Amino acid sequence: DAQTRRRERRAEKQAQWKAANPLLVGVSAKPVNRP
RNA sequence: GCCCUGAAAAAGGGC
Numbered sequence: 001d002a003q004t005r006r007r008e009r010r011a012e013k014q015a016q017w018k019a020a021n022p023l024l025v026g027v028s029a030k031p032v033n034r035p
Numbered sequence: 036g037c038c039c040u041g042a043a044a045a046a047g048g049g050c
Binding site: 003005010013014015017018020021024 | 037038041044
């Protein structure tokens, strides 16, 4: 189809969403900033 | 068949 294909074009929407939605991404997979 | 929206590995929508 074209949507499933468009999803590959959504990697920017996914990586932008995934970047701010780790909570909805692999439980226990949230980065932090306190070394 | 082509997309668009959804983050989607839902749900949706237009042509």
